[PDB]
Scaffold this motif. Structure first.
Motif, short mmCIF file in Angstrom:
data_model
loop_
_atom_site.label_atom_id
_atom_site.label_comp_id
_atom_site.label_asym_id
_atom_site.label_seq_id
_atom_site.Cartn_x
_atom_site.Cartn_y
_atom_site.Cartn_z
N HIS A 153 -6.64 11.18 12.45
CA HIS A 153 -6.41 9.75 12.27
C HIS A 153 -5.09 9.34 12.89
CE1 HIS A 153 -10.00 9.40 10.13
NE2 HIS A 153 -9.58 9.13 8.91
N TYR A 175 1.90 1.01 10.45
CA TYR A 175 1.67 1.13 9.02
C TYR A 175 0.51 2.06 8.71
CZ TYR A 175 4.92 -2.60 7.71
OH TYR A 175 6.04 -3.37 7.51
N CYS A 176 -0.51 2.09 9.57
CA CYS A 176 -1.64 2.99 9.37
C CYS A 176 -1.20 4.44 9.48
CB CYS A 176 -2.74 2.68 10.38
SG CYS A 176 -3.30 0.97 10.33
N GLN A 213 0.93 4.02 -2.91
CA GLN A 213 0.67 5.44 -2.57
C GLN A 213 1.77 6.32 -3.18
OE1 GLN A 213 -0.12 5.27 1.62
NE2 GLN A 213 -1.84 6.68 1.49
N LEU A 227 1.80 5.44 8.70
CA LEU A 227 2.59 5.67 7.50
C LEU A 227 1.70 6.02 6.31
CD1 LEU A 227 5.21 5.78 5.99
CD2 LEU A 227 5.16 3.29 5.77
N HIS A 228 0.60 5.29 6.13
CA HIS A 228 -0.26 5.53 4.97
C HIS A 228 -1.00 6.85 5.08
CE1 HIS A 228 -0.26 0.89 5.05
NE2 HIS A 228 0.69 1.30 4.23
N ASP A 229 -1.30 7.30 6.29
CA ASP A 229 -1.95 8.59 6.48
C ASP A 229 -0.97 9.75 6.53
OD1 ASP A 229 -4.35 7.24 6.54
OD2 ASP A 229 -5.11 8.34 8.27
N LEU A 239 0.86 -1.21 0.00
CA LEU A 239 0.00 0.00 0.00
C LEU A 239 0.88 1.24 0.00
CD1 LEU A 239 -2.57 -1.31 2.61
CD2 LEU A 239 -3.03 -0.94 0.18
N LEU A 298 0.58 9.01 -5.79
CA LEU A 298 0.61 10.40 -5.37
C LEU A 298 1.16 11.31 -6.46
CD1 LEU A 298 1.68 10.31 -1.61
CD2 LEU A 298 -0.38 11.35 -2.55
N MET A 333 1.46 9.74 4.44
CA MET A 333 1.59 9.89 2.99
C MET A 333 0.49 10.76 2.41
SD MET A 333 4.30 8.70 2.21
CE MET A 333 4.41 8.50 0.43
N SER A 334 -0.68 10.79 3.04
CA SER A 334 -1.86 11.39 2.44
C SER A 334 -2.02 12.87 2.77
CB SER A 334 -3.11 10.62 2.87
OG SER A 334 -3.37 10.79 4.25
N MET A 344 -5.79 -0.03 5.67
CA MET A 344 -4.82 -0.77 6.47
C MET A 344 -5.39 -1.27 7.79
SD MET A 344 -1.81 -1.99 6.24
CE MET A 344 -1.07 -3.09 7.44
N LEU A 383 -5.76 8.24 -0.90
CA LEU A 383 -5.56 9.10 0.25
C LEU A 383 -6.24 8.54 1.50
CD1 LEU A 383 -6.10 12.51 -1.56
CD2 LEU A 383 -3.94 11.38 -0.98
N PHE A 409 -5.98 5.24 2.25
CA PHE A 409 -5.34 3.90 2.41
C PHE A 409 -4.97 3.51 3.85
CE2 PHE A 409 -3.46 2.36 -1.94
CZ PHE A 409 -4.74 2.18 -2.41
N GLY A 410 -4.90 4.47 4.76
CA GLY A 410 -4.65 4.08 6.13
C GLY A 410 -5.84 3.50 6.84
N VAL A 411 -7.02 3.60 6.24
CA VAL A 411 -8.25 3.06 6.80
C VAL A 411 -8.81 1.94 5.93
CG1 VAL A 411 -10.65 3.58 7.40
CG2 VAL A 411 -8.82 5.18 8.04
N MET A 412 -9.06 2.22 4.65
CA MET A 412 -9.68 1.27 3.75
C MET A 412 -8.97 1.28 2.40
SD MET A 412 -13.69 0.94 2.61
CE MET A 412 -13.54 2.51 1.78
#
Ligand SMILES: CCCCCCCCCCCCCCCCCC(=O)OC[C@H](COP(=O)([O-])OCC(O)COP(=O)([O-])OC[C@@H](COC(=O)CCCCCCCCCCCCCCCCC)OC(=O)CCCCCCCCCCCCCCCCC)OC(=O)CCCCCCCCCCCCCCCCC
Ligand SMILES: CCCCCCCCCCCCCCCCCC(=O)OC[C@H](COP(=O)([O-])OCC(O)COP(=O)([O-])OC[C@@H](COC(=O)CCCCCCCCCCCCCCCCC)OC(=O)CCCCCCCCCCCCCCCCC)OC(=O)CCCCCCCCCCCCCCCCC
Ligand SMILES: CCCCCCCCCCCCCCCCCC(=O)OC[C@H](COP(=O)([O-])OCC(O)COP(=O)([O-])OC[C@@H](COC(=O)CCCCCCCCCCCCCCCCC)OC(=O)CCCCCCCCCCCCCCCCC)OC(=O)CCCCCCCCCCCCCCCCC
Ligand SMILES: CCCCCCCCCCC(CCCCCCCCCC)(CO[C@H]1O[C@@H](CO)[C@H](O[C@@H]2O[C@@H](CO)[C@H](O)[C@@H](O)[C@@H]2O)[C@@H](O)[C@@H]1O)CO[C@H]1O[C@@H](CO)[C@H](O[C@@H]2O[C@@H](CO)[C@H](O)[C@@H](O)[C@@H]2O)[C@@H](O)[C@H]1O
Ligand SMILES: CCCCCCCCCCCCCCCCCC(=O)OC[C@H](COP(=O)([O-])OCC[N+](C)(C)C)OC(=O)CCCCCCCCCCCCCCCCC
Ligand SMILES: CCCCCCCCCCCCCCCCCC(=O)OC[C@H](COP(=O)([O-])OCC[N+](C)(C)C)OC(=O)CCCCCCCCCCCCCCCCC
Lengths: 87, 81, 187, 558, 103, 117
Positions: free
Chosen positions: D68, D35-36, C90, D38-40, C86, C94, D42-43, D1, C146, C148-151
């Motif tokens: 988050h 990891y969660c 990203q 990390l992905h947030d 993931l 991005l 990134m966002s 994630m 954007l 991806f940390g949740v779903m």
């Protein structure tokens, strides 16, 4: 209009009841059905299938929460042996 | 007297000191002495990162202020009519 | 071949630094525009998971039974692989969003899409989905990385709702179709 | 994630019955939440008031993504309580890096580290923990009336399950029953409020409701009274879930009855998600022109509750003798400050709201961490106090009474000072971070003409300080009732420890005692970092306060 | 309602009113002219009218009164019966059709 | 009068006739503390897993009458939904909340002869 009266019946369940905790669980079921019935009738007036979809997820979630609540009651009753409030 | 690296190197040093005091463990035993460079090293790394964050925050806040005088100008100029 | 409507749908405009390439690129486009560093970041992040669990067993032993740690590592290794993948996705997507430096990606997209225009193929390809269901797919996975940390979500549909006015791809194609025409004549 | 981790953890959990896996599953949940983050992280490379996602049912903002990450970080810190044993054995002969990373130590750990404690044998505890997180982050990112309902039930039902997961405690099942029964009533008011919005507006979209609100705020036939009235009913259910007065009776009972480690998560995570969700809804429904709409604004329920929480939280805490009920009432007073900042909808108050929420979550986390650490530290101490012997669920809640803290300064002086710093941060003594939080809320309320509420906030603060001082007095002004355990240090009661190399070959053999049994490093370090953030905030405030300043500017950006 | 998906699989009956209202807001409201959203006010009232019908109900209550007051003043010498009306517009019932139409 | 309404009335009428006969013509004579015990948790589990699984089947019935429009895209979401609820059933099976293994000569002692001292 009927949906409003039903919400009162669920409301009135908490007013009249000092010692029946099972009635508290039932009065939540009455309130949730009353609100779902209101959404269903309004969805019919506004020709909107989203209202029916919202009601289906309320039935799913309220059924899910009834099972959690009964499980919590079972864990409670395993140790106490009564669902009666001494009052 | 607000230096990001010096302060955060010391912060990490203070974290180790307070930790050992909380455990009621001796503050300086020679076999454990590697930890203060480690705690202060990680502390210095956090503050190099805070340096870059502060730089981007300053740029973005500076950009916002310009947009605010810009908005006030074109509103005031529109009122000249 | 210009359809006189290069911007068919109302898209969401988001303030970013770099030009928007694609609000919803295809899965395969996000794999093909990945950089070597994206792979490097991908496995390194993926290795971190089981490595952290391993380091958490070396410094503070869990006192677990005979086969417990192998079972835990198996779940940690899968978590890190999912998390690492993931992160890799990203980093590539991005750049399509214009939220990361994307000069190399802007160039190859301009090249890749122009070749399709002159070859006659559709800009984003052909779909087995109804046009209405293509709108549903476009409105589901649009900017979805954007979240991806949740779903997680990936675009596997071939739709024509990419958030970008497509006139730029037709101007170049037309422009370099004449360059090859003049060169052909001067022979 | 978070959803992959929940499904993956469940599958691994489904095919095992081994309770010795519980500590490992908790650690993997820490890794998964990393990891969660990390992905947030990134966002966050975009500036927008909001991007609707997934068919418009969800949305993302810079604010949403910041919180988050905060929810993830709080959950990682709390997850340490079930991922590391409370106590360790330390010696100077096993302290080098070559030792920790190449050699091993051996001793009978089971009784020392409480290997079989109840909080280390619940396989599914980290999994229900992640379910609550999923509800919290989905509620932040919710853009639709149905999404609101589903996310709040998801978070709420998980919290009921966590309050009861200690199924052999009579206290915990009792507390689980109370939260579910009163929480289920609260959820009807949320569903009733959401339903009344739909039946009048014809939409479940928050976007569309804001558009309807915006045009109706002009300066005939379908006057939009429904919006304020529905959100009023809708808000009341959310005031219950943050334990705001007068809807706060459940929390002193639920927080005291459930185990302390559970209380740490249950009393922190839920306020962050509801308050952040409320913040956006307050902004977009806030009328500008002084019309008939503004006079019936639902946000007065927030201002009334802030007033009522300021009084109830401080006055009723005066007579509490049980430490967990005091923290519950201390929380109610702090949501009074939080609700004042949410009610004043100014740029200043929204910065104050954002800062207050984060610093209070960190500070309240420290108090629970210090309270659990003091409980795990009394293992090598005994007492003859007759009151302490008559306590229920001593294993789940080792510290239940303020009197148990008597003379803790003589048992562990520096840990007692960390408690005092945290409590002094709660009162608002400068230059602690708690002072700067109260200062920003008061300045924003004063600048908006909220003089009467600002005066009650200062007056209730002095009353609240009394029971805060009362905790400090027990720790510092008296000698302790706890004596060190004689049989732990009796000149002949020494247990053995082996130090072995990479090849499991002996290196040394040392005889050890109770004075070699220390607090585990994860808990001391977490207390030490947070305590120093509270104490040293005046030197580190630029980035932390600039983040909220930028966040509010995006939200308010005309 | 505003969803755009009706009961019979088609679109919801108030959706065109909802699209118009959103169209008026997006194209007449902006940061420069916060008063441009005033134009979207009659469009909003039409949307609420489609959902709830309180105006149309009010108009017909008044009109039924006048209609049912005119029929009392007049005297119906021979009003058509239910059977004859059922024969209206039929292949072999011209007399019933003529009688009902007063032609 | 709809055939469904008359059907309901007739079935009700049959039930009353059967009651009426046995109430009127059958004989009748006047021919007419308590301990307690714990109940089995398996009964709660059967009802709980039935209800939760009954809800999930209900949620799939719209798909079976909408498969043509849903096509591939709707099938993905249905498969995602089925996969998630299948994992909870694996939890049900793996932990045996219905007590699958409810009903169920290695010797710890080994002796060695060493002989005379
Ligand atoms: C699809 C079906 C094909 C794959 C299923 C079989 C794979 C082999 C699993 C196995 O060990 O079999 C023996 C295993 C018992 O063997 P054992 O001798 O007891 O081994 C000791 C323990 O299992 C202890 O060892 P264990 O815990 O490591 O083994 C359990 C196994 C269970 O993991 C799996 O079976 C993988 C399932 C999907 C692949 O592995 C894990 O738990 C670790 C990896 C977890 C992967 C979780 C993936 C979640 C879905 C994520 C979706 C989003 C991704 C993006 O029995 C099982 O089959 C367990 C799995 C349950 C079967 C249903 C799986 C499908 C559920 C619906 C689909 C969900 C997607
Ligand atoms: C505001 C923010 C400001 C940030 C800057 C402030 C200063 C930062 C200070 C934190 C430093 C923590 C620390 O390193 O303590 C070492 C800590 C020292 O404790 P000790 O008193 O000397 O002896 C331990 C006891 O004998 C027996 O150990 P134990 O059983 O009592 O505990 C086991 C071990 C836990 O085991 C671990 O080290 C966790 C490792 C997880 C993965 C971390 C690496 C990720 C990449 C993996 C590949 O202890 C800990 O490290 C507790 C750390 C708690 C941190 C809590 C998070 C923040 C609050 O652990 C060690 O024994 C040596 C570990 C050396 C490597 C540590 C792992 C790498 C850390 C990298 C950080 C980023 C670069
Ligand atoms: C896990 C087990 C995974 C089982 C799924 C195996 C897929 C088998 C099909 C295949 O591999 O050939 C590739 C084949 C490519 O077709 P093509 O001939 O190269 O044409 C290019 C495009 O399809 C462009 O042409 P198009 O525009 O006409 O594309 C429309 C597309 C329509 O495809 C779609 O509608 C896209 C759906 C993608 C969903 C992505 C989100 C996944 C994360 C969800 C998180 C919640 O129709 C297809 O291409 C055939 C796909 C048939 C439907 C696939 C349904 C399975 C997806 C769900 C897996 C099972 C549930 C696992 C959940 C477990 C939960 C515990 O089909 C796919 O697109 C596979 C997409 C699904 C992959 C899912 C991987 C993550 C799960
Ligand atoms: C006492 C401590 C002081 C305060 C500590 C942090 C306060 C300042 C943090 C500001 C912060 C962290 C948000 C997490 C904190 C949440 C709450 C924390 C608890 C508060 C105690 C949010 O920064 C965001 O702030 C928002 C406004 O506030 C802006 O709007 C956002 O645009 C901005 O990104 C910084 O975000 C930044 O991180 C760095 C990564 O190095 C990112 O750089 C890149 O990231 C990858 C591309 O993504 C790349 O791969 C990577 O190569 C590259 O490096 C940035 O891109 C940005 O993501
Ligand atoms: C502490 C809580 C748990 C943390 C561990 C899991 C962290 C999850 C997020 C993460 O991946 O970390 C980010 C970090 C940063 O990810 P990264 O992808 O940006 O790192 C880039 C590395 N280069 C520059 C070479 C491409 O992940 C890591 O890479 C950690 C570094 C060590 C990885 C393991 C080393 C190999 C071990 C093999 C055995
Ligand atoms: C409190 C502040 C928390 C800030 C966390 C953070 O920003 O880390 C960024 C990082 C971002 O990592 P990264 O992917 O940007 O790594 C650097 C990439 N290069 C090498 C190109 C520079 O997020 C994480 O690593 C997630 C794991 C950290 C959280 C672990 C538990 C805490």
């Amino acid at each position: 209009n009927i949906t409003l009266i039903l919400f009162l019946i669920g409301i009135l369940g908490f007013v009249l009841n000092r010692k029946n905790i099972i009635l508290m669980l039932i009065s939540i079921e009455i309130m949730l059905l009353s609100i779902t019935f209101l959404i269903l009738l309004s969805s019919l007036n506004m020709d909107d299938i989203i209202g029916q979809t919202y009601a289906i997820y309320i039935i799913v979630v309220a059924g899910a929460e009834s099972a959690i609540g009964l499980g919590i009651l079972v864990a409670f009753y395993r140790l106490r042996g009564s669902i009666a409030i001494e009052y | 007297m607000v230096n990001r690296i010096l302060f955060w190197t010391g912060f990490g040093l203070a974290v180790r000191f307070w930790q050992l005091g909380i455990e009621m463990r001796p503050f300086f035993n020679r076999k454990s002495l590697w930890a203060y460079p480690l705690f202060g090293g990680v502390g210095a790394s956090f503050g190099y990162w805070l340096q870059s964050i502060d730089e981007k925050q300053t740029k973005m806040l500076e950009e916002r202020k310009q947009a605010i005088l810009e908005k006030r100008a074109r509103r005031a100029q529109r009122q000249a009519e | 071949n210009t359809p006189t409507q290069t911007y068919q749908f109302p898209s969401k405009t988001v303030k970013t630094d770099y030009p928007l390439i694609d609000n919803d690129p295809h899965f395969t486009r996000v794999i093909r525009y990945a950089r070597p560093s994206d792979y490097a970041h991908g496995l390194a992040a993926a290795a971190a998971g089981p490595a952290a669990l391993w380091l958490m067993e070396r410094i503070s032993p869990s006192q677990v039974g005979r086969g417990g740690f192998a079972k835990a590592m198996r779940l940690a290794g899968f978590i890190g692989l999912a998390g690492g993948f993931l992160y890799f996705y990203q980093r590539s997507i991005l750049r399509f969003y214009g939220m990361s430096e994307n000069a190399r990606e802007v160039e190859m997209d301009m090249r890749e899409m122009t070749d399709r225009v002159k070859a006659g193929l559709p800009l984003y390809g052909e779909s087995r989905l109804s046009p209405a269901m293509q709108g549903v797919a476009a409105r589901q996975s649009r900017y979805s990385a954007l979240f991806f940390g949740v779903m997680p979500w990936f675009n596997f549909v071939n739709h024509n709702q990419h958030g970008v006015d497509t006139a730029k791809y037709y101007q170049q194609a037309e422009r370099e179709l004449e360059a090859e025409r003049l060169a052909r004549e001067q022979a | 994630m978070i959803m992959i981790s929940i499904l993956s953890l469940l599958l691994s959990t489904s095919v095992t019955l081994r309770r010795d896996m519980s500590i490992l599953f908790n650690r993997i949940s820490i890794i998964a939440l990393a990891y969660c983050i990390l992905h947030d992280t990134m966002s966050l490379s975009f500036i927008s008031k909001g991007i609707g996602l997934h068919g418009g049912l969800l949305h993302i903002t810079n604010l949403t993504q910041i919180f988050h990450i905060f929810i993830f970080i709080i959950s990682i810190l709390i997850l340490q309580l079930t991922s590391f044993y409370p106590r360790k054995v330390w010696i100077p002969e096993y302290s080098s890096l070559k030792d920790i990373f190449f050699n091993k130590i051996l001793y009978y750990r089971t009784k020392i580290i409480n290997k079989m404690g109840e909080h280390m044998k619940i396989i599914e505890y980290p999994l229900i923990l992640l379910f609550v997180i999923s509800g919290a982050v989905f509620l932040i990112s919710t853009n639709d009336l149905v999404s609101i309902f589903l996310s709040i039930e998801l978070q709420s039902y998980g919290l009921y399950l966590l309050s009861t997961i200690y199924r052999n405690s009579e206290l915990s099942t009792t507390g689980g029953l109370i939260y579910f029964l009163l929480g289920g009533l609260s959820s009807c008011f949320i569903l009733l409020g959401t339903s009344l919005l739909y039946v009048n507006s014809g939409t479940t979209s928050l976007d569309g409701l804001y558009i309807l609100n915006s045009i109706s705020d002009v300066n005939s036939w379908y006057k939009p009274y429904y919006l304020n009235f529905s959100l009023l009913i809708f808000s009341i259910g959310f005031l219950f879930k943050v334990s705001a007065a007068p809807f706060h009776f459940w929390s002193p009972d639920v927080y005291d009855a459930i185990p302390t480690i559970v209380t740490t998560f249950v009393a922190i995570i839920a306020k962050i998600s509801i308050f952040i969700f409320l913040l956006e809804l307050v902004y977009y429904t806030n009328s500008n022109a002084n019309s008939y709409l503004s006079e019936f604004s639902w946000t007065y329920a927030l201002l009334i509750s802030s007033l009522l929480s300021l009084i109830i939280g401080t006055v009723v805490g005066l007579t509490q003798f049980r430490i967990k009920r005091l923290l519950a009432y201390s929380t109610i007073s702090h949501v009074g400050f939080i609700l004042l900042a949410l009610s004043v909808s100014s740029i200043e108050s929204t910065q104050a709201f954002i800062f207050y929420l984060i610093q209070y979550s960190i500070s309240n986390l420290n108090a629970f961490f210090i309270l659990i650490t003091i409980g795990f530290s009394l293992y090598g101490y005994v007492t003859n106090n007759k009151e302490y012997k008559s306590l229920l669920d001593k294993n789940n809640s080792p510290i239940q009474l303020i009197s148990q803290l008597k003379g803790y300064f003589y048992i562990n002086p520096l840990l007692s000072l960390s408690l005092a710093i945290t409590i002094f941060s709660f009162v608002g003594v400068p230059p602690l971070v708690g002072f700067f939080a109260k200062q920003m809320v008061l300045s924003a309320a004063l600048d908006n003409g909220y003089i009467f509420l600002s005066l009650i906030a200062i007056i209730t603060s002095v009353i609240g300080a009394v029971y805060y001082l009362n905790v400090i007095k027990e720790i510092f002004f008296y000698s302790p009732e706890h004596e060190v355990n004689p049989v732990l240090n009796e000149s002949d009661s020494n247990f053995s420890l082996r130090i072995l190399n990479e090849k499991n070959v002996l290196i040394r053999s040392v005889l050890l005692k109770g004075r070699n049994i220390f607090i585990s490093s994860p808990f001391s370090i977490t207390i030490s970092i947070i305590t120093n953030v509270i104490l040293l905030f005046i030197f580190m405030n630029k980035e932390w306060l600039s983040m909220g300043t930028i966040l509010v500017q995006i939200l308010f950006s005309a | 309602m505003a969803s755009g998906y009706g009961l019979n699989g088609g679109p919801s009956r108030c959706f065109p009113f909802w699209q118009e209202l959103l169209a008026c807001y997006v194209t007449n409201s902006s940061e420069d002219n916060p008063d441009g959203k005033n134009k979207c006010i009659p469009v909003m009232e039409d949307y609420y009218e489609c959902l709830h019908h309180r105006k149309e109900a009010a108009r017909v209550r008044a009109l039924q009164a006048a209609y049912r007051e005119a029929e009392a003043k007049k005297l119906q010498e021979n009003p058509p019966t239910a059977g004859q009306i059922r024969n209206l517009g039929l292949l072999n019932k011209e007399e019933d059709t003529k009688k009902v139409h007063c032609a | 009068m709809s055939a469904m309404s008359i059907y309901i009335i007739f079935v009700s009428i049959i039930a009353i006739l059967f009651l009426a006969i046995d109430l009127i013509f059958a004989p009748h004579n006047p021919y007419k503390s308590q301990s307690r015990s714990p109940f089995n948790i398996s009964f709660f589990i059967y009802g709980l897993v039935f209800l939760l699984l009954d809800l999930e089947i209900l949620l799939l019935y719209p798909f079976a009458v909408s498969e043509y429009v849903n096509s591939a895209y709707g099938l993905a979401a249905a498969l995602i939904f089925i996969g998630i609820i299948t994992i909870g059933f694996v939890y049900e099976l793996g932990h045996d909340a219905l007590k699958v293994h409810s009903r169920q000569l290695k010797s710890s002692v080994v002796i060695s002869y060493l002989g005379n001292i």
